[PDB]
Structure 1
């Protein structure tokens, strides 16, 4: 839905890295290199960001009803 604040397994804060990750993917860096640069070293933290599906973009498309 929206990026989780913490890593499930260990609890590192990954919620402040989604925008940097998107900008890194924009400038051509492949996913492993982007995750390396954000200093996500444990594969739990890495799969937190690598497997996220951002559905809030899809939910926001339905007009506010008030």
Structure 2
């Protein structure tokens, strides 16, 4: 839905690196290189950031009820 605040396994704060990750992917950098530039060493954080689905962008398409 939205990027989780912390890594599920270890607990590193990864919720502040989503915009940076997307911007790094904008310049055509590979996903592994982008993850490396964010200092995500353990693969728990790597799967936390890499496999996330930003579903909230769909939820914001619907017109608000108020």
TM-score by length of 1: 0.99
How much is the aligned-residue C-alpha RMSD, in angstroms?
0.3
Aligned positions, number: 66
C-alpha distance after superposition, 1:32-63 (max 9, x if no partner):
00000000000000000000000000001000
How many angstroms apart in 1 are the aligned matches of 2:53 and 2:30? 17
How many angstroms apart in 1 are the aligned matches of 2:21 and 2:65? 32
TM-score by length of 2: 0.99
Structure 1 moving runs of 4+ over 3 Å: none
Runs (5+) with no aligned partner, structure 2:
none
SS at match of 1:46: helix
